[PDB]
Design an enzyme around this catalytic site. Sequence first.
Site, PDB file in Angstrom:
ATOM      1  N   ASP A 185       1.116  61.397   3.032  1.00 11.99           N
ATOM      2  CA  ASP A 185       0.601  60.069   4.246  1.00 11.99           C
ATOM      3  C   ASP A 185      -0.133  58.801   3.919  1.00 11.99           C
ATOM      4  O   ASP A 185      -0.639  58.949   2.800  1.00 11.99           O
ATOM      5  CB  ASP A 185      -0.384  61.428   5.212  1.00 11.99           C
ATOM      6  CG  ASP A 185      -1.324  60.720   6.583  1.00 11.99           C
ATOM      7  OD1 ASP A 185      -0.299  59.763   7.701  1.00 11.99           O
ATOM      8  OD2 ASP A 185      -1.660  61.180   6.686  1.00 11.99           O
ATOM      9  N   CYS A 219       6.242  62.294  11.738  1.00  7.46           N
ATOM     10  CA  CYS A 219       4.878  62.960  10.815  1.00  7.46           C
ATOM     11  C   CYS A 219       3.511  63.199  11.652  1.00  7.46           C
ATOM     12  O   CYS A 219       3.836  64.081  12.787  1.00  7.46           O
ATOM     13  CB  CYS A 219       5.187  61.525  10.327  1.00  7.46           C
ATOM     14  SG  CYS A 219       5.191  60.444  11.343  1.00  7.46           S
ATOM     15  N   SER A 220       2.742  62.638  11.460  1.00 11.40           N
ATOM     16  CA  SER A 220       1.432  63.475  12.012  1.00 11.40           C
ATOM     17  C   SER A 220       1.898  62.493  13.037  1.00 11.40           C
ATOM     18  O   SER A 220       1.685  62.817  13.999  1.00 11.40           O
ATOM     19  CB  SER A 220       0.553  63.199  10.659  1.00 11.40           C
ATOM     20  OG  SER A 220      -0.896  63.360  11.341  1.00 11.40           O
ATOM     21  N   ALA A 221       1.463  60.720  12.859  1.00 12.97           N
ATOM     22  CA  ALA A 221       1.850  60.558  14.084  1.00 12.97           C
ATOM     23  C   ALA A 221       2.767  59.575  14.700  1.00 12.97           C
ATOM     24  O   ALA A 221       3.420  59.130  15.617  1.00 12.97           O
ATOM     25  CB  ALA A 221       1.160  58.803  13.812  1.00 12.97           C
ATOM     26  N   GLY A 222       4.049  60.063  13.993  1.00 16.42           N
ATOM     27  CA  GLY A 222       4.899  59.893  13.989  1.00 16.42           C
ATOM     28  C   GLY A 222       5.215  57.692  14.419  1.00 16.42           C
ATOM     29  O   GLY A 222       5.515  57.245  15.254  1.00 16.42           O
ATOM     30  N   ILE A 223       4.514  57.223  13.134  1.00 11.45           N
ATOM     31  CA  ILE A 223       4.808  55.886  12.990  1.00 11.45           C
ATOM     32  C   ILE A 223       5.453  55.736  11.759  1.00 11.45           C
ATOM     33  O   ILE A 223       5.887  54.425  11.269  1.00 11.45           O
ATOM     34  CB  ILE A 223       3.520  55.121  14.015  1.00 11.45           C
ATOM     35  CG1 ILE A 223       2.555  55.646  13.735  1.00 11.45           C
ATOM     36  CG2 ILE A 223       3.700  55.387  15.313  1.00 11.45           C
ATOM     37  CD1 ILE A 223       1.538  54.808  14.046  1.00 11.45           C
ATOM     38  N   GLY A 224       4.286  56.198  11.032  1.00  9.74           N
ATOM     39  CA  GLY A 224       3.988  55.837   9.673  1.00  9.74           C
ATOM     40  C   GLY A 224       5.131  55.981   8.366  1.00  9.74           C
ATOM     41  O   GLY A 224       6.154  55.208   8.437  1.00  9.74           O
ATOM     42  N   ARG A 225       6.048  57.274   8.430  1.00  9.40           N
ATOM     43  CA  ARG A 225       6.894  58.080   7.274  1.00  9.40           C
ATOM     44  C   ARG A 225       7.784  57.887   8.531  1.00  9.40           C
ATOM     45  O   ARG A 225       8.639  57.497   7.520  1.00  9.40           O
ATOM     46  CB  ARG A 225       6.059  59.543   7.102  1.00  9.40           C
ATOM     47  CG  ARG A 225       4.969  59.218   6.264  1.00  9.40           C
ATOM     48  CD  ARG A 225       5.114  60.714   5.356  1.00  9.40           C
ATOM     49  NE  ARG A 225       3.715  61.333   6.851  1.00  9.40           N
ATOM     50  CZ  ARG A 225       2.546  61.728   6.153  1.00  9.40           C
ATOM     51  NH1 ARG A 225       2.779  62.483   5.146  1.00  9.40           N
ATOM     52  NH2 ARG A 225       1.894  62.548   7.555  1.00  9.40           N
ATOM     53  N   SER A 226       7.556  58.375   9.593  1.00 15.58           N
ATOM     54  CA  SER A 226       9.298  57.953  10.515  1.00 15.58           C
ATOM     55  C   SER A 226       9.408  56.653  10.710  1.00 15.58           C
ATOM     56  O   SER A 226      10.736  56.696  10.689  1.00 15.58           O
ATOM     57  CB  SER A 226       8.426  58.530  11.815  1.00 15.58           C
ATOM     58  OG  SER A 226       7.766  59.831  12.118  1.00 15.58           O
ATOM     59  N   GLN A 266       3.930  52.083   7.689  1.00 23.75           N
ATOM     60  CA  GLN A 266       1.892  51.772   8.406  1.00 23.75           C
ATOM     61  C   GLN A 266       0.777  51.152   7.227  1.00 23.75           C
ATOM     62  O   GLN A 266       0.266  50.962   7.151  1.00 23.75           O
ATOM     63  CB  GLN A 266       1.030  53.698   8.130  1.00 23.75           C
ATOM     64  CG  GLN A 266       1.450  53.241   9.796  1.00 23.75           C
ATOM     65  CD  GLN A 266       0.015  52.846  10.656  1.00 23.75           C
ATOM     66  OE1 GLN A 266      -0.277  53.059  10.554  1.00 23.75           O
ATOM     67  NE2 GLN A 266       1.057  52.365  11.929  1.00 23.75           N
TER      68      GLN A 266
HETATM   69  O1  LIG Z   1       2.498  60.770   9.273  1.00 26.07           O
HETATM   70  C1  LIG Z   1       2.277  59.386   9.282  1.00 26.07           C
HETATM   71  O2  LIG Z   1       2.968  58.675   8.264  1.00 26.07           O
HETATM   72  C2  LIG Z   1       1.147  58.173  10.196  1.00 26.07           C
HETATM   73  O3  LIG Z   1       1.655  57.350  10.479  1.00 26.07           O
HETATM   74  N1  LIG Z   1       0.155  58.790  10.714  1.00 26.07           N
HETATM   75  C3  LIG Z   1      -1.376  57.870  11.078  1.00 26.07           C
HETATM   76  S1  LIG Z   1      -0.879  56.575  11.580  1.00 26.07           S
HETATM   77  C4  LIG Z   1      -2.825  56.676  11.964  1.00 26.07           C
HETATM   78  C5  LIG Z   1      -3.341  57.961  11.847  1.00 26.07           C
HETATM   79  C6  LIG Z   1      -1.931  58.660  10.891  1.00 26.07           C
HETATM   80  C7  LIG Z   1      -2.819  60.020  10.513  1.00 26.07           C
HETATM   81  O4  LIG Z   1      -1.695  60.325  10.271  1.00 26.07           O
HETATM   82  O5  LIG Z   1      -3.981  60.227  10.329  1.00 26.07           O
HETATM   83  C8  LIG Z   1      -4.326  57.727  12.154  1.00 26.07           C
HETATM   84  C9  LIG Z   1      -4.958  56.827  12.780  1.00 26.07           C
HETATM   85  N2  LIG Z   1      -4.444  55.382  14.133  1.00 26.07           N
HETATM   86  C10 LIG Z   1      -3.447  55.085  12.961  1.00 26.07           C
HETATM   87 CL   LIG Z   2       0.348  48.215  12.852  1.00 24.87          CL
END
Ligand SMILES: O=C(O)C(=O)Nc1sc2c(c1C(=O)O)CCNC2
Ligand SMILES: [Cl-]
Length: 285
Positions: A185, A219-226, A266
Amino acid sequence: HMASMEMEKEFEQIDKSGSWAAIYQDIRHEASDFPCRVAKLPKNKNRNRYRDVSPFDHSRIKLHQEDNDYINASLIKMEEAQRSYILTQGPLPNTCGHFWEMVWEQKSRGVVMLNRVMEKGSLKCAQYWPQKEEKEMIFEDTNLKLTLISEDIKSYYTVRQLELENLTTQETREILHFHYTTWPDFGVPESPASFLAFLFKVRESGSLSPEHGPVVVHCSAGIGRSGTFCLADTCLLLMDKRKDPSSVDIKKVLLEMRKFRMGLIQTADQLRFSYLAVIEGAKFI
Ligand SMILES: O=C(O)C(=O)Nc1sc2c(c1C(=O)O)CCNC2
Ligand SMILES: [Cl-]
Ligand SMILES: [Cl-]
């Protein structure tokens, strides 16, 4: 190939000036800002994993039910690349039924998971699929059965075959689960090479083809890794589609993607990794 040259040159310049952080912040500053009214409705509060990660109204996936059509999921539609992805959060204990309802209704062939259920001691995603063949899962709220058909565990990722059955009709469908298990993450894959092998495996499966519904990526949020995964895939594809004289502007493509879902990629290093994967991928192909 002209595009390959220009992208390597751009990469080297950014890298020498140490501009990744500034360039990434520029992208954050200029990213699209659209309303998320449905996501923010009081009754949908427990359907969102993170308060700061919501689908835009205009691109959200609607569940085909009458009481509440909301799921934290967005359709990213890349016109030129002819790629569509659904990016969604890692399902919550109460939204696993919704998740698979979406998969069914959108006629997805594949699900790409880029996280582990537990990361650094914290729960990041519900266990939304069965871990033993003889222990299927039934989602009563959406009337779906989910069975583990087979599983192949490798050192960097796991590929599973799942069977999704609409209990209402007893129709069954085969879903491929591509689970990348070595992508931390807010981090990057261990190498461009292992990322590319994973991406090529997803590509080879047909899961990204127009002949199917859009792949589900999370992913967890669907934005960073996704975001990192889809950006690399789309940009690699554009590198191949576009004839000389051309170029692929990764920053512009990411901004394009962020029109459909907030916060894609992210960290600045995830952006840098995106460049690396596309550059190395293009060289290989
Ligand atoms: O799983 C990812 O790649 C991802 O974008 N995760 C994100 S984005 C994001 C968070 C997380 C998390 O996993 O805690 C926490 C706070 N807000 C933005
Ligand atoms: Cl951002
Ligand atoms: Cl896991």
